[PDB]
């Protein structure tokens, strides 16, 4: 007498019994990765850097991040049913992706062990599906280790929170009460997942929308750079950098017309599916754009400094696409990288400012390889690839001298949330008061100093675990001493 009943009308979580169940759960995992790793979730690492100043129209929404107000950042965020945003929103979305990737990988392994697939093509595909899930496990753990764990240069911490990392779920467990793991176990687990996933995936890229082994090479290069091991980063970035071509343009208009488009852009390694009705969003925090009739109005809540514009040459293409002099009807500069896409609108005349999600590009691999070759000692490949990236955008670099690298990495990865981690690695302090705003835009900005001084080795570069955690969990050690 068996007496369990399956709910009619919905499926539930268990080891898989066919192949179409595996394929549909994999598509659901990719649609979850689309909303987890947005550009909307990475504006908080970008606004905390030494680039932005807050304008008057801000209602203290981005000002806790720019002015470093540590009283609000200790328990910032919200992850209720209504909205998911903030530090707790970041923690919530990457933990949700990690839990559902654990469920998918364990179910596909338990299905491959019990021989439920009927032919050889389903097995040869299910092994690749499992190898796709391991990369998403490693990515969702690396994001939490990047933003909720200390560097090796931090001076004062909580007593005992120097070595530890994030909590490491290996199985599906929404009621998990456990302690933090060390940084060695977490980084070994990440690189072990990527090592197991690289040897299984095919060499060619089957689709842009799904994980390829080029993405695994590029992600392992980024993690090896962020730890600091430069020779292994050059070993893992050289296998992918020559596969994808750079942009082709002669003037800024066709560079804008190609770069905003997702399908015609040739240098995208991995992006999410985006259509006019499914999978598009408005990333209008940095520029603050809005549709007005048939045009765009701009009311930005944070504008860059004058040193940010002064790194950019006037004949550059990124001067018209990445940042833009459109504030106050052409008087000021905002960040216009994530503005829109021409293909995702309903009526072709009026805009709606919808942009798809991109997870990697070849410019990150170029900068990784030039940096690792300059630190290792290989000057010619470093200068070759850096002059190639400079000639692709129309502004040739003069001399590679380990500062023009910082200039090009600043010019290319603006808006993507990489300035804070690079500021940590290069031992750069904040210096928010020593910089000046735009001379052409005065009064719309404000010279408000920092609430908390940020020298090198400061603990506030890495955030704090949320307040609902570590109150219900007595085995948790927080990061900040205050």
């Amino acid at each position: 007498c068996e007496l369990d009943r399956d709910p009619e009308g919905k499926d539930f979580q268990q080891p898989y019994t066919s192949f179409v169940q595996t394929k549909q759960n994999r598509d659901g995992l990719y649609a979850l990765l689309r909303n987890t790793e947005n550009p909307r979730m990475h504006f908080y690492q970008e606004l905390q850097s030494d680039m932005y100043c807050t304008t008057i129209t801000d209602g203290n929404s981005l000002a806790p991040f720019v002015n470093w107000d540590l009283g609000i950042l200790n328990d910032h965020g919200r992850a209720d049913e209504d909205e998911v945003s903030g530090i707790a929103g970041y923690y919530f979305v990457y933990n949700r992706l990690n839990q559902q990737a654990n469920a998918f990988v364990n179910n596909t392994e338990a299905a491959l062990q019990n021989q439920v697939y009927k032919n050889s093509t389903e097995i040869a595909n299910a092994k690749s599906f499992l190898a796709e899930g391991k990369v998403l496990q490693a990515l969702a753990i690396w994001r939490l280790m990047d933003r909720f764990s200390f560097h090796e240069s931090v001076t004062e911490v909580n007593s005992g929170a120097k070595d530890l990392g994030v909590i490491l779920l290996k199985e599906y467990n929404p009621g998990y009460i456990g302690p933090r793991a060390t940084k060695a176990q977490c980084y070994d687990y990440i690189l072990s997942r990527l090592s197991e996933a690289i040897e299984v995936l095919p060499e060619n890229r089957e689709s842009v929308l799904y994980v390829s082994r080029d993405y695994a090479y590029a992600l392992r290069a980024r993690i090896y750079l962020a730890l600091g091991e430069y020779g292994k980063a050059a070993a893992d970035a050289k296998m992918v950098v020559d596969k994808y071509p750079l942009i082709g343009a002669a003037d800024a208009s066709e560079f804008e017309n190609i770069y905003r488009s997702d399908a015609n852009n040739p240098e995208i390694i991995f992006r999410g599916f985006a259509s006019a009705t499914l999978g598009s969003f408005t990333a209008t925090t940095l520029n603050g754009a809005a549709p007005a009739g048939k045009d765009i109005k701009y009311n930005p809540s944070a504008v860059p400094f004058q040193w940010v514009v002064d790194l950019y040459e006037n004949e550059d293409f990124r001067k018209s696409v990445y940042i833009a002099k459109v504030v106050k009807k052409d008087k000021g500069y905002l960040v216009n990288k994530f503005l829109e896409d021409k293909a995702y609108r309903d009526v072709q005349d009026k805009p709606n400012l919808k942009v798809g999600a991109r997870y990697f590009s070849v410019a990150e691999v170029y900068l990784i390889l030039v940096e690792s070759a300059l630190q290792t000692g290989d000057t010619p490949t470093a200068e070759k690839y850096l002059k190639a990236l400079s000639k692709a955008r129309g502004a040739e670099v003069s001399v590679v001298n380990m500062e023009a690298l910082q200039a090009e990495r600043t010019r290319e990865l603006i808006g993507e949330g990489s300035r804070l981690r690079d500021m940590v690695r290069w031992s750069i302090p904040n210096n928010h008061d020593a910089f000046e705003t735009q001379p052409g835009l005065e009064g719309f900005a404000n010279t408000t100093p920092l609430k908390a001084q940020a020298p090198v080795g400061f603990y506030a570069y890495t955030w704090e675990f949320p307040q609902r955690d570590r109150q219900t969990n007595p085995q948790l050690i927080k990061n900040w001493p205050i």
Binding site: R5, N95, P466
Partner: protein
């Protein structure tokens, strides 16, 4: 008496240790409503029952020994001579077939229905028919009327000529307007609305007047009526050598008192049969059926302008729904209306509804007695319900949005089945020792589904099939829902008795179920109990004491009224591209989902004096609930917003007592009385991850550790005589200080509990020469209720077009500065001044019967007797509530269906 508690044959009633309460067949029969539990308000001590609506299709809510859970249900287990039922299925059974009704409420009575008997169990037993030389026929017939309880909140409302003055002084009609300028033209211009429509273009001002100022209209007669009730039955009871039968056919029609329709009508039949085949076998079958047609008033509990009791209170008196002949018209008029508003019989005519339910119960047992004491019983049962409802919306009526019509059809099927196999053995070891041993197996299974299909766009009244709608855009997806569960169980029970004075019983049960999570699916429950007869051993005789028994027990039970599918991580649709679907997890489940385990300790004693003249029984219970269910809020490492796990603890401590007595005056007079009482106080022991207080979102209550769950609102301190604003108290800051500004930080825990602690009832009856008279009273004291209609009938600003209270005429102003009501430019909030004392004392029924004497039927061999009776239900109610009914609701009294008083008269020919 002999009570069958659980399984196996009955023991006794002075031997059981578990505090059961047996209700005989006098208190169940002759009742004029559909629910059978409502006739037990105030009879069984420690069981409170409240019917929260006056529908014919309403169902009472029963709670024995408090509310045992904050998170799951509280209703008991209702089983009917074997297999269990719902109250909607006992409502399709004739109550003249019930022989008894025993309520089992303490452990070592309930604890062999483990994982289902945390809330007690009601055990309804059906009649079996007496073995005699010739059988007997009994023919019952009744007729009654039903109407609304009290019309007290209409004594406070304004008239038309007062409401016009208050509205024009408040500035609702205009800035410089006045009466005889507002009265004459701006709203007696309802001829501009009554002129567009052809059916009433030529009839305005001749045979119907929508706006009338010379005298007010009666909205109670426009929204409530006096409704009949009929009932009849024929029953044949017979027997012979070994074989015994009881058959019955009956009919019961009851119509609701409101004008919006709600009827309950059934035709039912029963055949109980039991016959022994040979020396070692006996078979039997209980068969029943019904064809029941329900309909229920849906717009009660919601606020719509002109319906319910909200429409009696708030609709202004200068509007008139009648014509000049005193009958209800098709439409009435409100100001600013685009279309005229339909009255209640026209809206009942334009929106038909028809339900038909076919119900069958089949119950069968076979019993084998091979050896002198052994008894092997096997019992099977099926319970089948096929319902089929249909509701349409008629085309081409002029007072509507569109001339097109809609239709919807639904088919329901609920099939339940149950198997029970027991083996009993009883034997005496010595001349003074005795033992009984029972062990058995049970299997419960339920599956049910709903199918529905809808269509729209019809243009004719005759061409209203469902395959004649309009295609294209006027067609939608069907409805389809499926639920099911199953239970398996093995139980055992040992009854060891000494010679006369010591009895000890010990029981155990194992339950597995489809609802429990996949890591702990097997549940173990036990109980131990004992009764000591102190009169038969210690004090052998006395002059005033005739019986004295003591008993005590301890047991563990559980409550598996958790959902069918609440332990598993449901995946749903999350698409990636446009061609293929995706599935993603959306609830996270938990495999460790328990059965909400509770444990009860009980201690009591029962005495009887003056040779069983007076009788008393006192009971003390401590009932501790553990592992309750709450949809908890989760930490962020879950990746979800809820987990729905087992946390918390509660305890209910209480005392209940019951007295019965008999008084005399002669050899033919006979007076008797009874009175029972139950006090029950509860407290919440613990909660979630080390919390102390937790308020459930937008409910109105708070769960505080150390207190019962109370009301969580603002305090009210009245108005001030300086500026005349509302002043709420502050939680803390004693000096107490009041602030005029309202914020959500002014809320605190009120010291008034949600469930009423003190519950009781008392009966008194007399009998002279076959003419008897009985009267039963039922009281609930300590019950508070939020009166929601007083949000609308006495607010100063906002909702000004409605009828108000009379106490807004004494509003605070500069020349009138000593009152208790605020100014007119405000908006009242939900606070302490809406909590009202809903404690009541009802006279449940007054019944005067008369059996015709045996000398009148002497030569006639056909008719052997007769009975006549008059009965009045809900004759009086004393309370301090202001909302037409204190019983109809709980935590919130909305636009409610009041309970109704009824007068029935009946005959019964025992021919």
């Amino acid at each position: 008496q002999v009570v069958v508690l659980g399984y196996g044959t009955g023991q006794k009633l002075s031997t059981v240790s578990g505090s059961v309460a047996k209700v005989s067949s006098e208190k169940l029969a002759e009742k004029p409503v559909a629910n059978i539990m409502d006739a037990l308000q105030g009879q069984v001590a420690g069981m409170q029952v409240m019917t929260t609506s006056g529908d014919p299709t309403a169902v009472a809510s029963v709670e024995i020994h408090g509310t045992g859970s904050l998170g799951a249900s509280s209703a008991p287990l209702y089983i009917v001579d074997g297999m269990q039922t719902s109250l909607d299925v006992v409502a399709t059974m004739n109550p003249n077939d019930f022989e008894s009704m025993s309520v089992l409420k303490d452990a070592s009575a309930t604890s062999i229905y483990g994982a289902r008997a945390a809330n007690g169990v009601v055990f309804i037993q059906t009649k079996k028919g007496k073995m005699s030389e010739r059988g007997r026929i009994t023919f019952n017939a009744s007729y009654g009327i039903s109407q609304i309880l009290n019309t007290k909140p209409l004594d406070n409302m304004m008239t038309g000529d007062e409401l016009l003055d208050f509205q024009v002084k408040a500035g609702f009609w205009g800035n410089n307007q006045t009466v005889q300028k507002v009265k004459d033209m701006i709203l007696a211009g309802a001829e501009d609305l009554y002129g567009n429509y052809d059916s009433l273009k030529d009839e305005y001002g001749k045979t119907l007047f929508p706006v009338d100022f010379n005298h007010d209209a009666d909205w109670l007669k426009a929204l409530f009526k006096t409704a009949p009730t009929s009932q009849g039955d024929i029953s044949f009871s017979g027997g012979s050598q070994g074989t015994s039968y009881y058959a019955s056919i009956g009919y019961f029609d009851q119509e609701g008192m409101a004008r919006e329709p709600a009827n309950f009508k059934r035709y039912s039949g029963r055949l109980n049969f039991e016959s022994r085949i040979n020396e070692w076998l006996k078979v039997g079958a209980n068969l029943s059926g019904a064809i029941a047609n329900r309909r229920s008033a849906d717009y009660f509990g919601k606020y719509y302008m002109g319906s319910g009791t909200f429409g009696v209170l708030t609709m202004p008196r200068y509007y008139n729904p009648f014509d000049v002949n005193g009958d209800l018209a098709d439409v009435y008029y409100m100001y600013g209306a685009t279309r005229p508003s339909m009255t209640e019989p026209y809206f009942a005519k334009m929106r038909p509804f028809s339900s038909e339910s076919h119900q069958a119960n089949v119950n069968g047992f076979a019993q084998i007695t091979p050896i002198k004491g052994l008894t092997l019983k096997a019992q099977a049962g099926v319970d089948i319900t096929n319902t089929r409802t249909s509701s349409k919306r008629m085309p081409n009526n002029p007072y509507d949005s569109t001339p097109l019509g809609e239709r919807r059809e639904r088919a329901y099927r609920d099939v339940s089945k149950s198997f029970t196999n027991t083996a009993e053995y009883k034997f005496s070891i010595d001349e003074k020792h005795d033992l009984t041993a029972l062990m058995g197996h049970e299997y419960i299974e339920y599956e049910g589904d709903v199918i529905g299909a809808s269509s729209k766009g019809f243009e004719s009244d005759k061409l209203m099939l469902l395959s004649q709608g309009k295609t294209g855009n006027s067609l939608s997806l069907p409805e389809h829902r499926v639920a099911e569960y199953a239970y398996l169980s093995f139980f055992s029970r040992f009854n060891y008795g000494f010679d006369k004075w010591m009895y000890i019983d010990f029981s155990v049960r194992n339950d597995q179920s489809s609802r429990f999570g996949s890591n702990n699916r097997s549940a173990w429950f036990y109980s131990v109990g004992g009764m000591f007869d102190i009169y038969n051993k210690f004090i052998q005789e006395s002059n005033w004491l005739s019986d004295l028994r003591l008993k005590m027990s301890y047991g563990t039970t559980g409550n598996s009224e958790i959902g069918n599918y609440n332990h598993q991580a449901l995946v749903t649709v999350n698409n990636y591209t446009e061609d293929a679907m995706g599935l993603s997890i959306s609830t996270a489940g938990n495999p460790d989902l328990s059965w909400e385990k509770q444990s009860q300790f009980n201690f009591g004693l029962a005495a009887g004096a003056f040779n069983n003249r007076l009788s008393a029984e006192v009971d003390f219970y401590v009932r501790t609930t553990n592992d309750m269910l709450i949809d908890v809020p989760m930490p962020y490492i879950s990746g979800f917003f809820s987990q729905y796990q087992n946390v918390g603890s509660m305890k209910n401590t209480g005392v209940d007592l019951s007295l019965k007595g008999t008084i005399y005056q002669n050899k033919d007079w006979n007076v008797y009385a009874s009175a029972n009482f139950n006090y029950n106080r509860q407290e919440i022991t613990k909660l979630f991850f080390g919390l102390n207080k937790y308020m459930l979102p937008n409910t109105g209550t708070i769960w505080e550790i150390g207190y019962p769950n109370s009301f969580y609102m603002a305090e009210y301190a009245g108005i001030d005589k300086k500026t005349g604003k509302q002043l709420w108290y502050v939680p803390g800051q004693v000096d107490k200080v009041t602030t005029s500004q309202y914020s959500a930080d002014l809320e605190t825990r009120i010291d008034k509990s949600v469930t009423p602690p003190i519950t009781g009832g008392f009966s008194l009856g007399a009998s002279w020469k076959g003419l008897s008279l009985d009267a039963d009273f039922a009281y609930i004291v300590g019950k508070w209720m939020i009166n929601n209609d007083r949000y609308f009938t006495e607010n100063g600003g906002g909702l000004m077009q409605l009828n108000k209270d009379k106490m807004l005429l004494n509003a605070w102003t500069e020349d009138n500065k000593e009152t208790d009501v605020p100014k007119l430019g405000q908006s009242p909030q939900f606070d302490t001044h809406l909590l009202e004392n809903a404690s009541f004392l009802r006279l449940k029924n007054l019944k005067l019967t008369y059996v015709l004497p045996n000398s009148l039927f002497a030569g006639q061999n056909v008719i052997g007797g007769a009975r006549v009776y008059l009965m009045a239900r809900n004759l009086l109610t004393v309370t301090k509530y202001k909302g037409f009914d204190p019983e109809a609701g709980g935590n919130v009294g909305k636009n409610q269906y009041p309970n109704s008083k009824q007068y029935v008269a009946g005959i019964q020919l025992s021919f």
